[PDB]
Enzyme design. Structure first.
Site, PDB file in Angstrom:
ATOM      1  N   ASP A  33     -43.449   4.396   0.039  1.00 11.15           N
ATOM      2  CA  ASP A  33     -43.653   3.302   0.975  1.00 11.15           C
ATOM      3  C   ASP A  33     -42.733   3.269   2.189  1.00 11.15           C
ATOM      4  O   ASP A  33     -42.491   2.195   2.741  1.00 11.15           O
ATOM      5  CB  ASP A  33     -43.546   1.965   0.233  1.00 11.15           C
ATOM      6  CG  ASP A  33     -42.161   1.729  -0.353  1.00 11.15           C
ATOM      7  OD1 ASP A  33     -41.617   0.622  -0.156  1.00 11.15           O
ATOM      8  OD2 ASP A  33     -41.617   2.642  -1.011  1.00 11.15           O
ATOM      9  N   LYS A 146     -43.893  -4.517  -3.760  1.00  8.61           N
ATOM     10  CA  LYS A 146     -42.465  -4.253  -3.768  1.00  8.61           C
ATOM     11  C   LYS A 146     -41.822  -5.001  -2.602  1.00  8.61           C
ATOM     12  O   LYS A 146     -42.379  -5.069  -1.500  1.00  8.61           O
ATOM     13  CB  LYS A 146     -42.182  -2.760  -3.616  1.00  8.61           C
ATOM     14  CG  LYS A 146     -40.767  -2.382  -4.019  1.00  8.61           C
ATOM     15  CD  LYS A 146     -40.255  -1.181  -3.250  1.00  8.61           C
ATOM     16  CE  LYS A 146     -40.029  -1.537  -1.797  1.00  8.61           C
ATOM     17  NZ  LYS A 146     -39.241  -0.485  -1.097  1.00  8.61           N
ATOM     18  N   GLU A 187     -36.705  -6.037  -6.406  1.00 11.36           N
ATOM     19  CA  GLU A 187     -35.673  -5.055  -6.107  1.00 11.36           C
ATOM     20  C   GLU A 187     -34.418  -5.600  -5.434  1.00 11.36           C
ATOM     21  O   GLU A 187     -34.372  -5.758  -4.214  1.00 11.36           O
ATOM     22  CB  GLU A 187     -36.248  -3.920  -5.251  1.00 11.36           C
ATOM     23  CG  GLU A 187     -35.198  -2.921  -4.759  1.00 11.36           C
ATOM     24  CD  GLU A 187     -35.790  -1.766  -3.962  1.00 11.36           C
ATOM     25  OE1 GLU A 187     -36.948  -1.872  -3.506  1.00 11.36           O
ATOM     26  OE2 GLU A 187     -35.086  -0.752  -3.778  1.00 11.36           O
ATOM     27  N   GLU A 189     -31.315  -4.403  -4.601  1.00  8.96           N
ATOM     28  CA  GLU A 189     -30.463  -3.222  -4.522  1.00  8.96           C
ATOM     29  C   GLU A 189     -29.041  -3.473  -4.058  1.00  8.96           C
ATOM     30  O   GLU A 189     -28.804  -4.074  -3.012  1.00  8.96           O
ATOM     31  CB  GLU A 189     -31.068  -2.140  -3.619  1.00  8.96           C
ATOM     32  CG  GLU A 189     -30.176  -0.883  -3.575  1.00  8.96           C
ATOM     33  CD  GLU A 189     -30.718   0.260  -2.722  1.00  8.96           C
ATOM     34  OE1 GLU A 189     -31.811   0.129  -2.130  1.00  8.96           O
ATOM     35  OE2 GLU A 189     -30.031   1.304  -2.650  1.00  8.96           O
ATOM     36  N   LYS A 229     -36.428  -3.540 -10.263  1.00 12.06           N
ATOM     37  CA  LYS A 229     -36.071  -2.266  -9.643  1.00 12.06           C
ATOM     38  C   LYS A 229     -34.630  -2.417  -9.177  1.00 12.06           C
ATOM     39  O   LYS A 229     -34.371  -2.832  -8.051  1.00 12.06           O
ATOM     40  CB  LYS A 229     -36.984  -1.965  -8.448  1.00 12.06           C
ATOM     41  CG  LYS A 229     -36.702  -0.622  -7.777  1.00 12.06           C
ATOM     42  CD  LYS A 229     -37.836  -0.210  -6.842  1.00 12.06           C
ATOM     43  CE  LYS A 229     -37.536   1.110  -6.156  1.00 12.06           C
ATOM     44  NZ  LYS A 229     -38.672   1.566  -5.299  1.00 12.06           N
ATOM     45  N   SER A 300     -38.584   4.731 -10.146  1.00  9.33           N
ATOM     46  CA  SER A 300     -39.352   4.264  -8.996  1.00  9.33           C
ATOM     47  C   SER A 300     -38.590   4.968  -7.891  1.00  9.33           C
ATOM     48  O   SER A 300     -37.840   4.351  -7.131  1.00  9.33           O
ATOM     49  CB  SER A 300     -39.265   2.752  -8.809  1.00  9.33           C
ATOM     50  OG  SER A 300     -39.999   2.383  -7.650  1.00  9.33           O
ATOM     51  N   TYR A 363     -16.659  -1.603 -21.782  1.00 11.71           N
ATOM     52  CA  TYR A 363     -17.521  -2.001 -20.681  1.00 11.71           C
ATOM     53  C   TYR A 363     -17.726  -3.510 -20.682  1.00 11.71           C
ATOM     54  O   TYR A 363     -18.020  -4.061 -19.598  1.00 11.71           O
ATOM     55  CB  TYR A 363     -18.873  -1.288 -20.782  1.00 11.71           C
ATOM     56  CG  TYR A 363     -18.777   0.219 -20.647  1.00 11.71           C
ATOM     57  CD1 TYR A 363     -18.193   0.993 -21.653  1.00 11.71           C
ATOM     58  CD2 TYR A 363     -19.225   0.869 -19.494  1.00 11.71           C
ATOM     59  CE1 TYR A 363     -18.055   2.373 -21.515  1.00 11.71           C
ATOM     60  CE2 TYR A 363     -19.090   2.256 -19.346  1.00 11.71           C
ATOM     61  CZ  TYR A 363     -18.504   2.997 -20.362  1.00 11.71           C
ATOM     62  OH  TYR A 363     -18.357   4.358 -20.230  1.00 11.71           O
TER      63      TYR A 363
END
EC number: 4.1.2.13
Lengths: 363, 363, 363, 363
Positions: A33, A146, A187, A189, A229, A300, A363
């Site tokens: 995309d 998206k 998403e 990010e 995502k 993805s 962690y």
């Protein structure tokens, strides 16, 4: 304290069904995309004028790769332009995708915009007339969308405002999509830019995702009809400390386990700058991570699936099959990776089934 | 956006190990932490006067049941007084609990208080000097704690304020506990009071839990070192519409899957007024629910484990064995229930068929 | 979205009248609520044994000052111990205060506690049994209360958690107080510690106060029945840049105008480390600031009113008149300052107040 | 906790100067920004075709009234189309407005959209490309903008989501506007629809405005460079209980004093369905209210300034003078009203307040 159902049982069924087909075992997403301005950099990278024809041809090259990719590709994200183009044989690209078993997706955000009063942080625009656009995209073949939000790890970032605003706009986008039978890929990010270490990325990812899911809840989002995502949890690009793929995987799965409700149908990782091999190796380690993962952990990928193909192509129709072969190889590589049985280059023993726990409290 | 580790890897391990031991397969929690005023009412239902000796005796009766309960009981919650009481053999109750493979828990909240400006809503107090109390309780044998917040479904409840405040105080309590090596059981109970249906309860439970986990994230709580004690999802106590155990299980598990992160070690359901059999049957249906459940699903029953026992005892020390027998019966049943292997037999008497529902300040 | 009145028109009137009497024109607050541990540092600075009697004698020294302080002190904040002590004549201290025209106040918080996961940040405890305490204090002569929260300016502080938590606890404290006829003084002190400049302090003060009032709104607090005790906006103690009192005033008043609703009856500044003279000069500059100030701007000073009196006393009874003279002088000075009529020399004649050029757009 | 100046001192001055000009003493806003869809209903009511020419003529009719309106109108809000139209003399409307001493405003929202999962609630769209639009509008003569959010009082409305979302989008719009030298008028309109009483409207208005200002703070909005366009506090249009203008005024001023920071330059009330007279009477009572008001309390009327004008026009060019006369009449009335110098009883003007009756603690 009172419910006003956003979706009927039928609408939920459709969204859930779409979501599951996309991340079915061994399947992932081809993120093709790239916007006009984004793909320009890619084409200029191989010395090719950014014309609609070349873009059309390039997208055709990927979309028409042989059936070996079929079991590897559950979905394909397209940019508006491409959703309405056709292959040489006259078949609409959406038809090409579906004929190979893939679900068609459409990017719907309109890029990032700056947030005043922040240290270079942004939010994303694209909500105006989104409902009408989704209804049209649905009619024209798309079943999922998206929307990309971008956050940065820095001295004072991501700030409370950036986190809150991006989580909220992601929820509005998700709501609009589900209202139109479209599965929203959320998403959020977190860029890998910076010299921060693995712990820092994990911490920020945990905070961002918790904010994302609280917003989705506040906006009455049907999680089973969505996909996440996110960035994998890794040290910043400029971090001098080194980590194994097993630690990257541990930090990633740990962060997701502490924030993502089991109801979320799947996690489709963005590759964000990782090379094709690195992206595949890390996805494999993630799927082999000892801890329990209540959702599909797949890909993805944009660059991690196109790098070699774009290079092999070089903007010359002559290199058609050479280019597709590169894409096909990465599709196969990541299909195994999302299954936890990928081994780069050469390796003895096929499925790669093994176990071991690394610390787990570190962690 | 900067991490300031609330816990070291060592502290995390201790909390994680404790939480897992409490909800180990087949194991549940005996909740015998009724306050003086609370246990007093129970003693009246059997004509027994509320004295320290009677309370001590009753608690001894439960804690000293035969070794058949050992595999069924992962933890036992006690009230302050009982924590410092001893059995007839001179052994402190905590030592008794431990010798039988159980983890000792202590209730630390100081009850509910009214929230001004709300329609009869409350929050819970008990944070003052909590750190020192936890440090002391830890030295005295306790490894986990319990704090109860109470919410009610009504025309205007739970309100945004009630949800936010209760989630916040639960987070503060959880934070202090983890700083002292104590695993906090987060209990956001939504009362069954009212005539609302299943859907309404599921909706409210989802909103409440989303709020609870966002608060826990904001306060930097280590989820793997915690347990959740929520109400099962059921229609109101006055609801006329009937539902199956499978539906109750579906709504309960769905609500949890949509809000509780996989990292949470376990869910220990409160019985909230359900009969002993009803509580066991639903817990069994919950564990049999087809959906993926990333956390142990068990019990932390008070009334659902003590109903028949109290009746069999009746205050007469001669019925010691009779009482304990009824308790062991329920512990064995719920031990199987939390494994999805329970099947009613026909016993437990009519005392296990009666509901233990109690309203609040008339109606 | 529905109102459930937390207060009747009569309760509101009582709280409003109390709040206004405290900050009536020319009046401020004497903050003598130092806990035994805190007052120990004061007594030790003058080589005096920290005994209940010396504490009583000292509090008596301040409270029984001649009638000149009457029009200067609208209220006096006391520590629990003192609320129940008596003057030499046998009069309870609350009676002494009231006979001189002062409203009696009582500090109700139980000190700060560390917030886990933060860079040395804290919240404040004291809510447990607070309602019962307030009902008793009201009965015993107190009409207002004081609760102190502390925030710090650092590289990563005040954090989102710190701001949110402290604002929430202050709201709970205010809510309980109002249900018992006690006017709550909301004190969210931002320490002067550090090398940050004036604009940094103003920024943080603005964000903190915005959070404080949103919380008060969420908890249904009656603003007209409250007072605010904030830090003045000043550069950090270790800041190298120098600022005029006019700049401090502008920054302080600007911060307040941007966050404090006009309904708030009054703002009583804490002196927080400033000398007696600078605390008075700044308060005066604040009141002369060329901007609309919809609330009384006065004082609630501890050290800024006691400094010289304490030293002059030195723990010697022979110095009583001398020590009281030092207190009265500061009381008179600040009385004039909260009216913008303070000058190193003034009575019933003035016409100065020349302040040209101050572009408040620089704030 | 770290500042990143959204604006420079110069940008702040420009915005502040603009905001102050709009609400200078005795001045108000003419809201003639009806979109094609809304204006169509206005022309239809008087049997007039909804053509571009008729819309241009009607707007010309209002904008070119004689100089008597000059002192009454500090600003005029226009819809996109009108901003680019011209009067019969060839002068663009923005120039016409300015030559009469008015500031030009531009509506920039793109209408309301439904919030899924709510009972018919909405949020507002229009952020996409808003920055570029703002930069263009500035160049073309606009100095301020308008964005309308709509909330409704109902059984379960306004919901937490509706309040949070609308407050957030208003903040985003304000942030973008200020980055382009445009003063944003924040309009969170609570509809009069329903049978709720005055107390309910006051409660919801207080909660809505508290949310709006917290959002503005979170987004780093410069309040001095903004205006607020709220609904007056009134009973529902169908409320059975009846109230007086003084009661409406007290409820309105009280709600504002409890939520609007003094730093806000002005409050420009929307008429919301009120008749021309009632809107003027209430604004007068608001400005006569005994309570302290730290901001200009003026008008931003559409229908309340156009009702009679539109009716006198009738779509006939020969009714130009008569129509403008009716508008000038309402402009003069409201100019006096925003100063508390308006008297009804026909063309009167020689009466002041009367009938002493405090008791404001009832609000």
């Amino acid at each position: 304290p009172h419910s006003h159902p956003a979706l009927t049982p039928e609408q939920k069924k459709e969204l859930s069904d779409i979501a599951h087909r996309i991340v079915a075992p061994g399947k992932g997403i081809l993120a093709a995309d790239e916007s006009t301005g984004s793909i320009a950099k890619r084409l200029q990278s191989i010395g090719t004028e950014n014309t609609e024809e070349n873009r059309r041809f390039y997208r055709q090259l990927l979309l028409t790769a042989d059936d070996r990719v079929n079991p590897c590709i559950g979905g394909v994200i397209l940019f508006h332009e491409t959703l309405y183009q056709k292959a040489d044989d006259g078949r609409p690209f959406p038809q090409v995708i579906k004929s190979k078993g893939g679900v068609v997706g459409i990017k719907v955000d309109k890029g990032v915009v700056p947030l005043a009063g922040t240290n270079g942080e942004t939010t994303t625009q694209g909500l105006d007339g989104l409902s009408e656009r989704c209804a049209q995209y649905k009619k024209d073949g798309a079943d999922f969308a998206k929307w990309r939000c971008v956050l940065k790890i820095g001295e004072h970032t991501p700030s409370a405002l950036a986190i809150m605003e991006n989580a909220n706009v992601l929820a509005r986008y998700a709501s609009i999509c589900q209202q139109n039978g479209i599965v929203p890929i959320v998403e959020p990010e977190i860029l890998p830019d910076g010299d921060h270490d693995l712990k820092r990325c994990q911490y920020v990812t945990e905070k961002v995702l918790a904010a994302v899911y609280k917003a989705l809840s506040d906006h009455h989002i049907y999680l089973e009809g969505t996909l996440l995502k996110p960035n994998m949890v890794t040290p910043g690009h400029a971090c001098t400390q080194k980590y194994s793929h097993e630690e990257i995987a541990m930090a990633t799965v740990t962060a997701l386990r502490r924030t993502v409700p089991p109801a979320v149908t799947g996690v489709t990782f963005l590759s964000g700058g990782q090379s094709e091999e690195e992206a595949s190796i890390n996805l494999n380690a993630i799927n082999k991570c000892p801890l329990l993962k209540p959702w599909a952990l797949t890909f993805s990928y944009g660059r991690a699936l196109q790098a070699s193909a774009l290079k092999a192509w070089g903007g010359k129709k002559e290199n058609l099959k050479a280019a597709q072969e590169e894409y096909v190889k990465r599709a196969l590589a990541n299909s195994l990776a999302c299954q936890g049985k990928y081994t780069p280059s050469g390796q003895a023993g096929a499925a790669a089934s093994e176990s071991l726990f690394i610390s787990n409290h570190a962690y």
